[PDB]
Design an enzyme around this catalytic site. Structure first.
Site, PDB file in Angstrom:
ATOM      1  N   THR A   1      -6.943   3.472  -1.875  1.00  0.00           N
ATOM      2  CA  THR A   1      -6.666   2.038  -1.790  1.00  0.00           C
ATOM      3  C   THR A   1      -7.787   1.203  -2.397  1.00  0.00           C
ATOM      4  OG1 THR A   1      -5.371   2.411   0.229  1.00  0.00           O
ATOM      5  CG2 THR A   1      -6.102   0.113  -0.211  1.00  0.00           C
TER       6      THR A   1
ATOM      7  N   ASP B   1     -20.697  12.520 -26.154  1.00  0.00           N
ATOM      8  CA  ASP B   1     -20.843  11.668 -24.979  1.00  0.00           C
ATOM      9  C   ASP B   1     -21.736  12.384 -23.965  1.00  0.00           C
ATOM     10  OD1 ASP B   1     -20.663   9.505 -23.290  1.00  0.00           O
ATOM     11  OD2 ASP B   1     -18.684  10.043 -22.494  1.00  0.00           O
TER      12      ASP B   1
ATOM     13  N   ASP C   1       0.827  -1.192   0.000  1.00  0.00           N
ATOM     14  CA  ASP C   1       0.000   0.000   0.000  1.00  0.00           C
ATOM     15  C   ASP C   1       0.869   1.253   0.000  1.00  0.00           C
ATOM     16  OD1 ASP C   1      -1.930   2.008   0.548  1.00  0.00           O
ATOM     17  OD2 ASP C   1      -3.242   0.458   1.440  1.00  0.00           O
TER      18      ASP C   1
ATOM     19  N   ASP D   1     -21.827   8.208 -28.452  1.00  0.00           N
ATOM     20  CA  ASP D   1     -23.275   8.310 -28.386  1.00  0.00           C
ATOM     21  C   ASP D   1     -23.894   7.794 -29.677  1.00  0.00           C
ATOM     22  OD1 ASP D   1     -23.043   9.464 -25.942  1.00  0.00           O
ATOM     23  OD2 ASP D   1     -23.780  11.460 -26.547  1.00  0.00           O
TER      24      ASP D   1
ATOM     25  N   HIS E   1      -2.662  10.912  -0.278  1.00  0.00           N
ATOM     26  CA  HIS E   1      -2.769  10.484  -1.658  1.00  0.00           C
ATOM     27  C   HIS E   1      -4.244  10.506  -2.008  1.00  0.00           C
ATOM     28  CE1 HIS E   1      -4.391   6.590  -0.397  1.00  0.00           C
ATOM     29  NE2 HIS E   1      -3.550   6.713   0.609  1.00  0.00           N
TER      30      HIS E   1
ATOM     31  N   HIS F   1      -0.998   2.855  -5.127  1.00  0.00           N
ATOM     32  CA  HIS F   1      -0.891   4.283  -5.443  1.00  0.00           C
ATOM     33  C   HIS F   1       0.380   4.795  -4.773  1.00  0.00           C
ATOM     34  CE1 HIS F   1      -1.864   5.001  -1.316  1.00  0.00           C
ATOM     35  NE2 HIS F   1      -2.983   4.314  -1.440  1.00  0.00           N
TER      36      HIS F   1
ATOM     37  N   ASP G   1       2.358   2.713   3.115  1.00  0.00           N
ATOM     38  CA  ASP G   1       1.310   3.723   3.169  1.00  0.00           C
ATOM     39  C   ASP G   1       1.222   4.355   4.554  1.00  0.00           C
ATOM     40  OD1 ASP G   1      -1.215   4.926   1.889  1.00  0.00           O
ATOM     41  OD2 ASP G   1      -2.106   3.923   3.600  1.00  0.00           O
TER      42      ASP G   1
ATOM     43  N   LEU H   1     -18.320   6.326 -23.992  1.00  0.00           N
ATOM     44  CA  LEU H   1     -18.585   5.602 -25.227  1.00  0.00           C
ATOM     45  C   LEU H   1     -19.326   6.497 -26.212  1.00  0.00           C
ATOM     46  CD1 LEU H   1     -19.847   2.177 -23.806  1.00  0.00           C
ATOM     47  CD2 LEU H   1     -17.494   3.029 -24.067  1.00  0.00           C
TER      48      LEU H   1
ATOM     49  N   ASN I   1     -12.861   5.239  -1.233  1.00  0.00           N
ATOM     50  CA  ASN I   1     -12.784   4.520   0.039  1.00  0.00           C
ATOM     51  C   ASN I   1     -14.069   4.710   0.821  1.00  0.00           C
ATOM     52  OD1 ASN I   1     -10.234   3.505  -0.288  1.00  0.00           O
ATOM     53  ND2 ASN I   1      -9.261   4.864   1.227  1.00  0.00           N
TER      54      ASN I   1
HETATM   55  O1  LIG Z   1      -6.234  -7.741   3.595  1.00  0.00           O
HETATM   56  C1  LIG Z   1      -6.181  -6.703   2.662  1.00  0.00           C
HETATM   57  C2  LIG Z   1      -5.829  -6.964   1.302  1.00  0.00           C
HETATM   58  C3  LIG Z   1      -5.856  -5.886   0.418  1.00  0.00           C
HETATM   59  C4  LIG Z   1      -5.346  -6.085  -0.990  1.00  0.00           C
HETATM   60  C5  LIG Z   1      -4.961  -7.266  -1.605  1.00  0.00           C
HETATM   61  N1  LIG Z   1      -4.424  -6.977  -2.783  1.00  0.00           N
HETATM   62  C6  LIG Z   1      -3.941  -8.005  -3.688  1.00  0.00           C
HETATM   63  C7  LIG Z   1      -4.581  -8.025  -5.052  1.00  0.00           C
HETATM   64  C8  LIG Z   1      -3.948  -8.757  -6.049  1.00  0.00           C
HETATM   65  C9  LIG Z   1      -4.505  -8.814  -7.314  1.00  0.00           C
HETATM   66  C10 LIG Z   1      -5.688  -8.134  -7.560  1.00  0.00           C
HETATM   67  C11 LIG Z   1      -6.312  -7.408  -6.551  1.00  0.00           C
HETATM   68  C12 LIG Z   1      -5.761  -7.354  -5.282  1.00  0.00           C
HETATM   69  C13 LIG Z   1      -4.358  -5.629  -2.950  1.00  0.00           C
HETATM   70  C14 LIG Z   1      -3.893  -4.812  -4.020  1.00  0.00           C
HETATM   71  C15 LIG Z   1      -3.981  -3.427  -3.915  1.00  0.00           C
HETATM   72  C16 LIG Z   1      -4.526  -2.828  -2.780  1.00  0.00           C
HETATM   73  C17 LIG Z   1      -4.993  -3.619  -1.732  1.00  0.00           C
HETATM   74  C18 LIG Z   1      -4.908  -5.038  -1.839  1.00  0.00           C
HETATM   75  O2  LIG Z   1      -6.086  -4.659   0.819  1.00  0.00           O
HETATM   76  C19 LIG Z   1      -6.433  -4.357   2.078  1.00  0.00           C
HETATM   77  C20 LIG Z   1      -6.711  -2.989   2.383  1.00  0.00           C
HETATM   78  C21 LIG Z   1      -7.074  -2.665   3.678  1.00  0.00           C
HETATM   79  O3  LIG Z   1      -7.364  -1.348   3.987  1.00  0.00           O
HETATM   80  C22 LIG Z   1      -7.148  -3.641   4.673  1.00  0.00           C
HETATM   81  C23 LIG Z   1      -6.860  -4.965   4.360  1.00  0.00           C
HETATM   82  O4  LIG Z   1      -6.906  -5.963   5.346  1.00  0.00           O
HETATM   83  C24 LIG Z   1      -6.500  -5.319   3.035  1.00  0.00           C
HETATM   84  C1  LIG Z   2     -15.116  -0.622 -19.262  1.00  0.00           C
HETATM   85  O1  LIG Z   2     -15.435  -2.039 -19.324  1.00  0.00           O
HETATM   86  C2  LIG Z   2     -16.814  -2.341 -19.093  1.00  0.00           C
HETATM   87  C3  LIG Z   2     -16.949  -3.848 -19.167  1.00  0.00           C
HETATM   88  O2  LIG Z   2     -16.705  -4.324 -20.486  1.00  0.00           O
HETATM   89  C4  LIG Z   2     -17.699  -1.623 -20.111  1.00  0.00           C
HETATM   90  O3  LIG Z   2     -19.028  -1.812 -19.645  1.00  0.00           O
HETATM   91  C5  LIG Z   2     -19.812  -2.655 -20.471  1.00  0.00           C
HETATM   92  O4  LIG Z   2     -20.430  -1.803 -21.345  1.00  0.00           O
HETATM   93  C6  LIG Z   2     -21.322  -2.423 -22.274  1.00  0.00           C
HETATM   94  C7  LIG Z   2     -21.731  -1.342 -23.249  1.00  0.00           C
HETATM   95  O5  LIG Z   2     -22.487  -0.337 -22.580  1.00  0.00           O
HETATM   96  C8  LIG Z   2     -22.509  -2.955 -21.502  1.00  0.00           C
HETATM   97  O6  LIG Z   2     -23.350  -3.657 -22.411  1.00  0.00           O
HETATM   98  C9  LIG Z   2     -22.052  -3.900 -20.403  1.00  0.00           C
HETATM   99  O7  LIG Z   2     -23.148  -4.076 -19.511  1.00  0.00           O
HETATM  100  C10 LIG Z   2     -20.868  -3.351 -19.584  1.00  0.00           C
HETATM  101  N1  LIG Z   2     -20.267  -4.430 -18.804  1.00  0.00           N
HETATM  102  C11 LIG Z   2     -19.973  -5.648 -19.308  1.00  0.00           C
HETATM  103  C12 LIG Z   2     -19.398  -6.645 -18.342  1.00  0.00           C
HETATM  104  O8  LIG Z   2     -20.139  -5.927 -20.499  1.00  0.00           O
HETATM  105  C13 LIG Z   2     -17.399  -0.127 -20.154  1.00  0.00           C
HETATM  106  O9  LIG Z   2     -18.117   0.494 -21.219  1.00  0.00           O
HETATM  107  C14 LIG Z   2     -15.904   0.127 -20.333  1.00  0.00           C
HETATM  108  N2  LIG Z   2     -15.624   1.553 -20.273  1.00  0.00           N
HETATM  109  C15 LIG Z   2     -14.968   2.203 -21.233  1.00  0.00           C
HETATM  110  C16 LIG Z   2     -14.802   3.680 -21.025  1.00  0.00           C
HETATM  111  O10 LIG Z   2     -14.579   1.638 -22.254  1.00  0.00           O
HETATM  112 CA   LIG Z   3     -21.937   8.015 -24.548  1.00  0.00          CA
HETATM  113 ZN   LIG Z   4      -3.526   2.395  -0.492  1.00  0.00          ZN
HETATM  114 ZN   LIG Z   5      -3.208   5.687   2.531  1.00  0.00          ZN
END
Ligand SMILES: O=c1cc(-c2cn(Cc3ccccc3)c3ccccc23)oc2cc(O)cc(O)c12
Ligand SMILES: *[C@@H]1O[C@H](CO)[C@@H](O[C@@H]2O[C@H](CO)[C@@H](O)[C@H](O)[C@H]2NC(C)=O)[C@H](O)[C@H]1NC(C)=O
Ligand SMILES: [Ca+2]
Ligand SMILES: [Zn+2]
Ligand SMILES: [Zn+2]
Ligand SMILES: CC(C)CCC[C@@H](C)[C@H]1CC[C@H]2[C@@H]3[C@H](O)C=C4C[C@@H](O)CC[C@]4(C)[C@H]3CC[C@]12C
EC number: 3.1.4.39
Length: 779
Positions: free
Chosen positions: A158, A659, A120, A667, A415, A308, A260, A665, A179
């Site tokens: 976060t 848009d 973090d 229009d 942040h 971040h 963090d 997207l 958050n």
């Molecule tokens: O147990 C906690 C776990 C997490 C996160 C876990 N992953 C891994 C991951 C890997 C691939 C895809 C998505 C996520 C993170 C990545 C970025 C930021 C946060 C997390 O965030 C917390 C934040 C809290 O404030 C308190 C917590 O206990 C957790």
């Molecule tokens: C970001 O990705 C999401 C998921 O693909 C896009 O949202 C989809 O948009 C289509 C078109 O409106 C919808 O039919 C779906 O319901 C949405 N979700 C999924 C899972 O298909 C979204 O448009 C994307 N954003 C940008 C800016 O490209």
């Molecule tokens: Ca649009």
């Molecule tokens: Zn964070």
């Molecule tokens: Zn923070």
């Protein structure tokens, strides 16, 4: 619904069902409930986390936090230094880097596991500001694949970023837009603290662990109750990796609250930052040491990633809304490094966002935030299309906070700011058999990572906002092969089909290969449009929208800028290639008190007086507010030549964007909400330009044979310049700052236009996909 089973070895176990019988998980403390004789047999601390010589060969003492006994390797609950201290092995960080060409996995492993080590608030620059103190992290970085930095999503908080990492979606699409959030449909608030966040209703999209599960790939539990010490998190992952190969997960996540937390207390560049960074590296070393003694260090793909960065922010640098508004008790503010404002609504619909925004606009010369309606925020933020995002948004200057009143230093870092601010950038390292060896890659956005994590696990990604294939250059092997989308609408190439006599437009005048360097853009929706050729530019003219979808032209370094002769200022000429009924008319503009017009190819860059007449065709004209023409005219008369001069020529593609429903997207015609008065001429919400040149600036843009260089923008087409506090000054003092704020990816313009660019180049399509996701930050 039960608090007293005995989790028969279920401590941190990856198999659960609903209630009763308490659950055996590292989330049990978060739900204040596990089979709580699943507890203190599981959270030991005795004798620390490292073996000492005197412990080697001990008989297992169940009270020790980790073990140095001969049965520990079996269960994976040895201290991670066990073999270094007791078996004469070396620390992983002390070993040379050896390329991993294929995964070297032990018996029973069908695919290389993925471990995401998330940290973090790990600012990208920490990779140096404390480099001599992170030997394990620097080894992963130099021997694996790394980028100089990875860009987070906005807000740079976060939970929006962890869930973007998990889903590949922008926050507006996955739902975790802060958050803290209020949802008017639930009529409830989501917070970092508390239990509301555990309700699945808040969480959209499809996160990696669910994608894996749905496709038959077991996932470990990505989340850790904060009470679980980081060392135990590592040891639990290692214990899971030791399970039999029908219980063993293939993907794991470690999470650390540091750096963090220390960044908040001391700021990102206090000398106190070194200790947390040392501690994080020690933990990485425990992980790598633990993998090595399980013979997994050349089998597992490891991702080291932050959510971040961290900025210098002190209580002294706080703007107070009460210094701008006379009635801050009628509004609710989500405060801090961003602002979101909504009504407190117990006795109030005198609440009007229009007045509040006006009251927050350029009220103090050194004002350290800017108000926006969310649809007017820079489109690159993709921060508007969600009912949890308040209409009113405050973009806060880096290093500042916004608060409601002076009643709301203990902290020195924070942040959450604009995600192109350099202090918000974070880190990416990938290390393992599937990542490249000793390879540096350009910075990329964290929305791309979900596709890569899917590729690393053999999963098909759920639909997301990454561009699948733009990160293939991170990977040694089994990449996904992207293919260019097929063109949907084919252009017409009309010749001279009508003569000047058939036109009733109300327009008057005083008139009596080079420009498509990367191939024609493909139109990916169903429409009717015409290719129009001119000496100086080429356009795709929509007969539906009565205006180009794109206008492409090349401007050499040596191009001369000319002015619009007095006799031509009002000139608009009929285009004999286009039916009068698919043409705009000049009376609509004379009748629209609020709307003027501009041109997409600039008459100021015509190549001859002859060719200049081409620029005044009705097919080159677009509706523009007079306020916006101040912007557009400066760009076309001054900035384009400047860019050509700095970059050894430029190719420019400009056009409109519609848009009105701010979903990022293009229009449909039905979604367009504004037309030039008493006309069928739609009003764009934005105007884009894509400016391309040779990355090797020693070659002219029209003679480039290597990588390209692009910068793009999506300028808001607004009837005023209230966003630009200095717009009363000469344009040289504010227009370029405006454009830099509204920088964009080509991909952003693609979504907003339905066009596909760069379809004819000497580059690989994967390489082109990287170009299209690039963002010129000016940071
Ligand atoms: O147990 C906690 C776990 C997490 C996160 C876990 N992953 C891994 C991951 C890997 C691939 C895809 C998505 C996520 C993170 C990545 C970025 C930021 C946060 C997390 O965030 C917390 C934040 C809290 O404030 C308190 C917590 O206990 C957790
Ligand atoms: C970001 O990705 C999401 C998921 O693909 C896009 O949202 C989809 O948009 C289509 C078109 O409106 C919808 O039919 C779906 O319901 C949405 N979700 C999924 C899972 O298909 C979204 O448009 C994307 N954003 C940008 C800016 O490209
Ligand atoms: Ca649009
Ligand atoms: Zn964070
Ligand atoms: Zn923070
Ligand atoms: C107490 C804090 C330290 C930790 C908070 C953890 C919490 C944010 C996590 C833990 C359980 C998670 C949900 C669970 O994985 C089921 C899914 C299904 C998926 O389709 C959408 C997301 C969701 C609801 C997870 C969201 C995040 C949760 C609540």
């Amino acid at each position: 619904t039960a608090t007293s089973g005995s989790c028969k070895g279920r401590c941190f176990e990856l198999q659960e069902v609903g209630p009763p019988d308490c659950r055996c998980d590292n989330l049990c403390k978060s739900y204040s409930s596990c089979c709580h004789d699943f507890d203190e047999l599981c959270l030991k601390t005795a004798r620390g986390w490292e073996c000492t010589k005197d412990r080697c060969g001990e008989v297992r003492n169940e009270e020790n936090a980790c073990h140095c006994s001969e049965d520990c390797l079996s269960r994976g609950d040895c201290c991670t230094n066990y073999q270094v201290v007791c078996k004469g092995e070396s620390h992983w960080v002390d070993d040379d880097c050896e390329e991993i060409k294929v995964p070297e996995c032990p018996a029973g492993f069908v695919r290389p596991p993925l471990i995401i080590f998330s940290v973090d608030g790990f600012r990208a620059s920490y990779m140096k500001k404390g480099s001599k103190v992170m030997p394990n992290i620097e080894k992963l970085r130099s021997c694996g694949t790394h980028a100089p930095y990875m860009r987070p999503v906005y807000p740079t908080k976060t939970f929006p970023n962890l869930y973007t990492l998990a889903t590949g979606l922008y926050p507006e699409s996955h739902g975790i837009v802060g958050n803290s959030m209020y949802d008017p449909v639930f009529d409830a608030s989501f917070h970092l603290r508390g239990r509301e966040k555990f309700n699945h209703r808040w969480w959209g999209g499809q996160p990696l662990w669910i994608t894996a599960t749905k496709q038959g790939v077991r996932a470990g539990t990505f989340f850790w109750s904060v009470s679980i010490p980081h060392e135990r998190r590592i040891l639990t992952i290692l214990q899971w990796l030791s399970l039999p190969d029908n219980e063993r997960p293939s993907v794991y996540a470690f999470y650390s609250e540091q750096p963090d937390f220390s960044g908040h207390k001391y700021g990102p560049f206090g000398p106190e930052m070194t200790n947390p960074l040392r501690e994080i590296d020690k933990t990485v070393g425990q992980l790598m040491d633990g993998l090595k003694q399980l013979r997994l260090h050349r089998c597992v793909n490891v991702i080291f990633v932050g959510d971040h960065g961290m900025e210098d922010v002190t209580c002294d640098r706080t703007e107070f809304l009460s210094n701008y508004l006379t009635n801050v008790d009628d509004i609710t503010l989500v405060p801090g490094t961003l602002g979101r404002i909504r009504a407190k609504s117990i006795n109030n619909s005198k609440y009007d966002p229009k007045t509040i925004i006006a009251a927050l606009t350029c009220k103090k010369p050194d004002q350290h935030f800017k108000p926006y309606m969310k649809q007017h925020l820079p489109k690159r933020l993709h921060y508007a299309n969600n009912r949890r995002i308040e209409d009113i948004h405050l973009l806060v200057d880096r290093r500042w906070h916004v608060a409601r009143k002076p009643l709301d230093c203990f902290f020195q870092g924070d942040h959450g700011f604009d995600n192109k601010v350099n202090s918000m950038q974070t880190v990416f390292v990938g290390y393992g058999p599937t990542f490249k060896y000793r390879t540096k890659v350009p910075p990329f956005e964290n929305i791309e990572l979900y596709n890569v994590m899917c590729d690393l696990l053999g999963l098909k990604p759920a639909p997301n906002n990454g561009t699948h294939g733009s990160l293939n250059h991170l990977l040694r092997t089994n990449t996904f092969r992207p293919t260019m989308p097929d063109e949907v609408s084919r252009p017409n190439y009309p010749g001279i089909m009508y003569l000047q006599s058939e036109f009733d437009l109300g327009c008057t005048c005083d008139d009596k290969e080079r420009h498509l360097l990367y191939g024609r853009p493909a139109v990916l929706y169903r429409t009717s449009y015409d290719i129009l050729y001119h000496t100086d530019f080429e356009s795709g003219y929509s007969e539906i929208f009565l205006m180009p979808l794109w206008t492409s032209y090349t401007i050499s370094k040596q191009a001369e800028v000319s002015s619009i002769p007095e006799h031509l200022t009002n000139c608009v000429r009929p285009d004999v290639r286009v039916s009068p009924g698919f043409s705009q008319n000049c009376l609509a503009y004379k009748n629209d008190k609020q709307m003027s017009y501009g041109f997409l190819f600039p008459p100021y860059l015509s190549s001859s007086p002859e060719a200049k007449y081409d620029a005044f065709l009705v097919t080159n004209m677009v509706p523009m507010y007079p306020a916006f023409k101040r912007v557009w005219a400066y760009f076309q008369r001054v900035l384009v030549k400047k860019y050509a001069s700095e970059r050894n020529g430029v190719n420019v593609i400009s056009g409109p964007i519609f848009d009105y429903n701010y979903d990022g997207l293009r229009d449909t015609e039905d979604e367009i909400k504004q037309y030039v008065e008493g006309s069928s001429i739609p009003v764009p919400t934005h105007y884009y330009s894509i400016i391309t040149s040779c990355l090797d600036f020693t070659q002219p843009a029209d003679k480039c044979d290597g990588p390209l260089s692009v910068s793009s923008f999506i300028l808001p087409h607004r009837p005023d310049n209230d966003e630009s506090c200095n717009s009363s000054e000469d344009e040289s003092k504010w227009v370029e700052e405006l454009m830099k704020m509204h920088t964009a990816r080509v991909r952003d313009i693609e979504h907003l236009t339905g066009l596909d660019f760069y379809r004819k180049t000497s580059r690989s399509y994967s390489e082109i996909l990287t170009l299209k996701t690039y963002l010129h930050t000016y940071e």
